[PDB]
Enzyme design. Sequence first.
Site, mmCIF file in Angstrom:
data_model
loop_
_atom_site.group_PDB
_atom_site.id
_atom_site.type_symbol
_atom_site.label_atom_id
_atom_site.label_comp_id
_atom_site.label_asym_id
_atom_site.label_seq_id
_atom_site.Cartn_x
_atom_site.Cartn_y
_atom_site.Cartn_z
ATOM 1 N N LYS A 165 0.812 -1.188 0.000
ATOM 2 C CA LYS A 165 0.000 0.000 0.000
ATOM 3 C C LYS A 165 0.854 1.249 0.000
ATOM 4 O O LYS A 165 0.514 2.215 -0.689
ATOM 5 C CB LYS A 165 -0.959 -0.052 1.176
ATOM 6 C CG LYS A 165 -1.825 1.175 1.283
ATOM 7 C CD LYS A 165 -2.855 1.043 2.357
ATOM 8 C CE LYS A 165 -3.629 2.280 2.742
ATOM 9 N NZ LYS A 165 -4.767 1.889 3.624
ATOM 10 N N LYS A 214 -9.223 11.081 -0.917
ATOM 11 C CA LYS A 214 -8.148 11.144 0.048
ATOM 12 C C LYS A 214 -7.749 12.602 0.203
ATOM 13 O O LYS A 214 -7.408 13.226 -0.801
ATOM 14 C CB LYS A 214 -6.952 10.317 -0.434
ATOM 15 C CG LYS A 214 -5.926 10.025 0.634
ATOM 16 C CD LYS A 214 -4.773 9.151 0.188
ATOM 17 C CE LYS A 214 -3.865 8.688 1.314
ATOM 18 N NZ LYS A 214 -2.856 9.746 1.676
ATOM 19 N N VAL A 223 -5.090 14.461 1.394
ATOM 20 C CA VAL A 223 -3.726 14.864 1.156
ATOM 21 C C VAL A 223 -2.910 13.610 0.865
ATOM 22 O O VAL A 223 -3.197 12.531 1.382
ATOM 23 C CB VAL A 223 -3.078 15.567 2.360
ATOM 24 C CG1 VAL A 223 -3.772 16.887 2.682
ATOM 25 C CG2 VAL A 223 -3.125 14.645 3.570
ATOM 26 N N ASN A 224 -1.927 13.739 0.028
ATOM 27 C CA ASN A 224 -1.070 12.616 -0.316
ATOM 28 C C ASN A 224 0.207 13.137 -0.862
ATOM 29 O O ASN A 224 0.253 14.172 -1.502
ATOM 30 C CB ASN A 224 -1.771 11.742 -1.309
ATOM 31 C CG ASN A 224 -1.126 10.383 -1.436
ATOM 32 O OD1 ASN A 224 -1.133 9.598 -0.488
ATOM 33 N ND2 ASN A 224 -0.596 10.081 -2.587
ATOM 34 N N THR A 225 1.303 12.427 -0.681
ATOM 35 C CA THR A 225 2.578 12.758 -1.275
ATOM 36 C C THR A 225 3.065 11.623 -2.151
ATOM 37 O O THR A 225 2.996 10.478 -1.726
ATOM 38 C CB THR A 225 3.615 13.031 -0.168
ATOM 39 O OG1 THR A 225 3.155 14.120 0.642
ATOM 40 C CG2 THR A 225 4.983 13.405 -0.744
ATOM 41 N N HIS A 257 4.308 3.585 5.851
ATOM 42 C CA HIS A 257 3.531 4.766 6.031
ATOM 43 C C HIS A 257 4.360 5.973 5.667
ATOM 44 O O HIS A 257 5.554 5.995 6.006
ATOM 45 C CB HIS A 257 3.029 4.821 7.484
ATOM 46 C CG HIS A 257 2.616 6.109 7.979
ATOM 47 N ND1 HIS A 257 1.411 6.651 7.733
ATOM 48 C CD2 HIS A 257 3.307 7.022 8.749
ATOM 49 C CE1 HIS A 257 1.316 7.869 8.330
ATOM 50 N NE2 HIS A 257 2.490 8.089 8.953
ATOM 51 N N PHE A 258 3.765 6.943 5.013
ATOM 52 C CA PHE A 258 4.420 8.180 4.710
ATOM 53 C C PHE A 258 3.987 9.173 5.779
ATOM 54 O O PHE A 258 2.814 9.495 5.871
ATOM 55 C CB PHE A 258 4.024 8.705 3.319
ATOM 56 C CG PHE A 258 4.871 9.872 2.879
ATOM 57 C CD1 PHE A 258 4.533 11.173 3.243
ATOM 58 C CD2 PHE A 258 6.031 9.686 2.167
ATOM 59 C CE1 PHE A 258 5.327 12.230 2.895
ATOM 60 C CE2 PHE A 258 6.853 10.718 1.803
ATOM 61 C CZ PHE A 258 6.523 12.005 2.196
ATOM 62 N N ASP A 259 4.952 9.651 6.567
ATOM 63 C CA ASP A 259 4.589 10.507 7.689
ATOM 64 C C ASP A 259 4.638 11.982 7.359
ATOM 65 O O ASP A 259 3.689 12.696 7.769
ATOM 66 C CB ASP A 259 5.487 10.198 8.898
ATOM 67 C CG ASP A 259 4.789 10.576 10.213
ATOM 68 O OD1 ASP A 259 3.638 10.078 10.407
ATOM 69 O OD2 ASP A 259 5.334 11.318 11.032
#
Length: 124
Positions: free
Chosen positions: A7, A41, A43-45, A119-121
């Site tokens: 993911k 979603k 926000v996402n990077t 996880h992207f923090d």
Amino acid sequence: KETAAAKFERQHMDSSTSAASSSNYCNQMMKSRNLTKDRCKPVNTFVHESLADVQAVCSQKNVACKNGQTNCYQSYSTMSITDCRETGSSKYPNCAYKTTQANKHIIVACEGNPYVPVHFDASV
């Protein structure tokens, strides 16, 4: 079911481009990566680096995650990233995003053997 590592790659990796090429990058990518299917979603990077370079962050500078977990790591180097966050007009199913290009360090949480991002923090 999809692993946390898988993911992370689906949500956050884009090794196929060096940077966002247009203002519609996020609109297209959020859709293509299925991040708008059930809800927008917020926000996402995306990270424009090789997967191995991002996985390597799990052996870089330990730092506590935003949520306090201690399995987070900051990259030693800046990376090419794209920040995506919803525009004021975004309204499911017509999710809409602002694309912002940046070069920043990343912070990821890592788990497993091999020890990889899950996880992207933050971008920092």
